[PDB]
């Protein structure tokens, strides 16, 4: 079939299963596809959502060695528009919806449901590891 | 040039960037090859090496979505053995040695050396964002 570029953006902090199946799906939700990831900057990532404990580069590094992953930018916008889907080519953009931001890329079309995995977290395997310390 | 199979095991706990540059250079020793990854049991790790957070299942799941992992066996044997490399074919098991268990493997040419990289694993990421709360 003909090749879909699908867009999908994050922080991508301590990636983990969690982050991987998002990805996955994204990159498979038709048969051939171009999977572009985009990587918030350290600075609106903070102002806007919260705390992130690896940088830019750190964040996008990890990410160059997740099989889905076609290309990557970094860092993002951190509010897509419709000129970047113009300028990068980008049929879908692959989000968790998670007033409605993205009510124009429903509108076009061109916005593709994922879903997370709760529970695979990096911080629930440190959770995991102090268990093995009775509080008594 | 032909395909050249490599093996390398390990017990990818909590998967990092450290691991991740190990998988790549593993992959990358020629230029066509097929990288096997081995990943521990669990008993057998926690007798001989030390505390596992993730079972054998997670850990497996993680390594799949890896770049540079074309196979996997899980569990993987503890020990390397020359009937093992016949069976799957292996023509390099790639480690980084760190009295000498794979002395036979040099001897047979069949050892290639990959490294690690410090400061990068998951347990210190967890010690960053500790320094965020003063002692005093």
Redesign the interface.
């Known amino acids: 079939s003909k090749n879909v570029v699908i867009y999908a953006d994050g922080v991508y902090d ?1 990636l ?2 969690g982050h ?1 199946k998002q ?2 799906q994204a990159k498979k939700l038709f048969e051939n596809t171009t999977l572009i990831v985009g990587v918030t900057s350290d600075n609106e990532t903070k102002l806007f959502k919260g ?1 992130v ?2 940088t830019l580069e ?1 964040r996008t ?2 990410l160059k ?5 076609d290309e990557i930018i970094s860092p993002c916008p951190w509010v897509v528009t419709p000129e970047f889907l113009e300028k990068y080519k980008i049929d879908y953009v692959a989000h968790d919806d998670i007033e409605d931001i993205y009510a124009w890329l429903k509108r076009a079309g061109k916005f593709k449901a994922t879903q997370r995995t709760e529970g695979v977290s ?1 911080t629930d ?2 959770v ?2 102090l268990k ?1 310390y009775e509080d008594y």
Chains 1, 2 share one sequence.
């Not at 060695?65 to 992953?69: C, D, L, T």
């Open positions: 301590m983990h299963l991987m990805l996955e705390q404990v690896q750190e590094e990890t060695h997740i099989r889905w992953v990096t395997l440190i995991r590891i093995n």
